[PDB]
Design a protein around this ligand. Structure first.
Ligand SMILES: O=P(O)(O)OC[C@H]1O[C@@H](O)[C@H](O)[C@@H](O)[C@@H]1O
Ligand SMILES: [Mg+2]
Ligand code: NA
Length: 218
């Protein structure tokens, strides 16, 4: 049986991928870059703050100063942080709280493998911190998603090998990171976005312990 579940946060535990998108789109348009639509944003999900800004700047081959780059990232974060202040336990996606309780009851470790430095704050907002055995610090890894490092770190933080873990993800970059870690990915979203080569569920209510067990078996 699998021994750990490695959770992405944004777009898996709650609808904060929507808020990252809105904040990045607003920032892009302030600097005159209009290509950040929902389709392009699939390339941004799971990606670090700095890599997200760089991918946006790459759209118009746009060149800002180092000072401007830092200020733009800060501006986006300040906006995002304001948008999430009213997140509450009511915003936890369907099925997720039950899954956490069921994993815990079955002595399966629970780790966060989010690229977001706002992850710990969001778990507190949602009253979820006590369910997590570990949070992998996205600033500590040498390589961010789509590199596997954060998933490897999350597994190791709970004393489990990635090969004994399931990873839950809503993003292309994160699914790739799970694949390259050795853990088993189960995506949530559209195969059109996430691929036709791994198990994908249409919504988080499908993330039941019972379903995870069967995926593991097969
Ligand atoms: O800017 P933060 O909060 O550190 O988040 C970093 C990244 O965190 C990931 O969880 C999100 O999918 C990305 O959209 C985001 O860019
Ligand atoms: Mg995500
Ligand atoms: Na406008």
């Amino acid at each position: 049986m699998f021994k750990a579940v490695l959770f992405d946060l944004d777009g898996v535990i709650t609808d904060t991928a929507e808020y990252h998108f809105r904040a990045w789109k607003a920032l892009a348009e302030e600097i005159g870059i209009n290509g950040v639509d929902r389709q392009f944003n699939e390339q941004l999900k799971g990606v670090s703050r700095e890599d997200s800004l760089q991918k946006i700047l790459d759209l118009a081959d746009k060149k800002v100063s180092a000072e401007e780059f830092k200020e733009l990232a800060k501006r986006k974060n300040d906006n995002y942080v304001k948008m999430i202040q009213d997140v509450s336990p009511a915003d936890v996606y369907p099925g997720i709280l039950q899954l956490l309780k069921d994993l815990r009851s079955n002595k399966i470790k629970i780790a966060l493998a989010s690229a977001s430095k706002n992850g710990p704050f969001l778990l507190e907002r949602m009253n979820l911190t006590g369910y997590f055995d570990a949070i992998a610090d996205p600033a500590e890894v040498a390589a961010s998603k789509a590199a596997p490092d954060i998933f490897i770190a999350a597994a190791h933080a709970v004393g489990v090998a990635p090969s004994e873990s399931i990873g839950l993800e809503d993003s292309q970059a994160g699914i790739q990171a799970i694949k390259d870690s050795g853990a088993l990915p189960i995506g949530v979203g559209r195969p059109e976005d996430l691929g036709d080569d791994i198990v994908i569920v249409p919504d988080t209510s499908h993330y039941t312990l019972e379903f995870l067990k069967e995926v593991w078996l097969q």
